[PDB]
Design an enzyme around this catalytic site. Structure first.
Site, short mmCIF file in Angstrom:
data_model
loop_
_atom_site.label_atom_id
_atom_site.label_comp_id
_atom_site.label_asym_id
_atom_site.label_seq_id
_atom_site.Cartn_x
_atom_site.Cartn_y
_atom_site.Cartn_z
N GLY A 67 1.87 6.81 8.71
CA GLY A 67 3.16 6.94 8.57
C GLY A 67 4.08 6.18 9.08
N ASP A 97 -0.27 -7.47 1.53
CA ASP A 97 0.26 -6.20 1.56
C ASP A 97 1.72 -6.05 1.78
OD1 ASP A 97 0.29 -3.43 1.80
OD2 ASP A 97 -0.53 -3.32 4.06
N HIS A 122 0.79 -1.23 0.06
CA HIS A 122 0.09 0.05 -0.03
C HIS A 122 0.90 1.20 0.16
CE1 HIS A 122 -0.11 0.01 4.48
NE2 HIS A 122 -0.38 1.51 4.22
N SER A 164 3.46 2.85 8.20
CA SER A 164 3.21 1.97 7.17
C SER A 164 4.26 1.44 6.62
CB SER A 164 1.80 2.46 6.08
OG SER A 164 0.82 2.50 6.87
N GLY A 165 4.39 0.16 6.37
CA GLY A 165 5.50 -0.51 5.61
C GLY A 165 6.82 -0.91 6.52
#
Ligand code: VXU
Ligand code: CA
Length: 223
Positions: A175, A84, A40, A177-178
């Protein structure tokens, strides 16, 4: 990260920031030329920033390296966030050192109650917005599959797990994320999604990296 602490500069040396003119997601360095992040987080024109602590100040240990390729998982579904995960290849290899280091991949999935470290430059407010300039950290346990699926009925797949606190207070947030969820020295999770941050009975949801090790190794080896 809501409810966390200041990590300390370069204490999480596999944490990278993905920049496209500004920080927009985290990622994890898995070898000198590859980063793993959330699908994402995909965008064209990513610069990977390694060795960061304050993302707003050049402190002298950073490396900025443009991505040469992104590879989103073949079964990533943006409607459900199933799978994801993405891979990002660096245009040139990172210089590995004390502050710029890779995180090992898991070999089996981790048990419920295992303690993990989650890190990132995301929002630190559960109500409101405030973005930190330095890397924040949170120790959080893997929650049972049953309490994860009870928290989000109908939405948790075999490729997701929850980590956190059902009481709330302490969670990843926008923020983050990942970015990484590391447990026993292994990258077990990627910050994926949730419902708000640090709310009661709404713990963070993480991409279950152990399901992807064969894809990660075969994809890197072929690219
Ligand atoms: N709290 C987990 C979480 C993690 C990353 C992004 C998020 C998020 O929560 C959903 C609302 C903000 O976006
Ligand atoms: Ca910096």
């Amino acid at each position: 990260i809501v409810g966390g602490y200041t990590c300390g500069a370069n204490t999480v040396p596999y944490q990278v920031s993905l920049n496209s003119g500004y920080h927009f997601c985290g990622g994890s360095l898995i070898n000198s030329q590859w980063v793993v992040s959330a699908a994402h987080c995909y965008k064209s024109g990513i610069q990977v920033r390694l060795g960061e602590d304050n993302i707003n100040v050049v402190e002298g240990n950073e490396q900025f390296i443009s991505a040469s390729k992104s590879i989103v998982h073949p079964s990533y579904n943006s409607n459900t966030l199933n799978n994801d995960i993405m891979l990002i290849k660096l245009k040139s290899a990172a210089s590995l050192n004390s502050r710029v280091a890779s995180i090992s991949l898991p070999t089996s999935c981790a048990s419920a109650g295992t303690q993990c470290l989650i890190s990132g430059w995301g929002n630190t407010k559960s109500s409101g917005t405030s973005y930190p300039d330095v890397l924040k950290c949170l120790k959080a346990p893997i929650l049972s599959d049953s309490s994860c699926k009870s928290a989000y009925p109908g939405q948790i797949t075999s490729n997701m797990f929850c980590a956190g606190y059902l009481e709330g207070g302490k969670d990843s947030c926008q923020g983050d994320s990942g970015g990484p969820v590391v447990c026993s020295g292994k990258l077990q999770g990627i910050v994926s999604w949730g419902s708000g941050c640090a709310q009661k009975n709404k713990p963070g949801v993480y991409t279950k990296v152990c399901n992807y090790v064969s894809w990660i190794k075969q994809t890197i080896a072929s690219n």
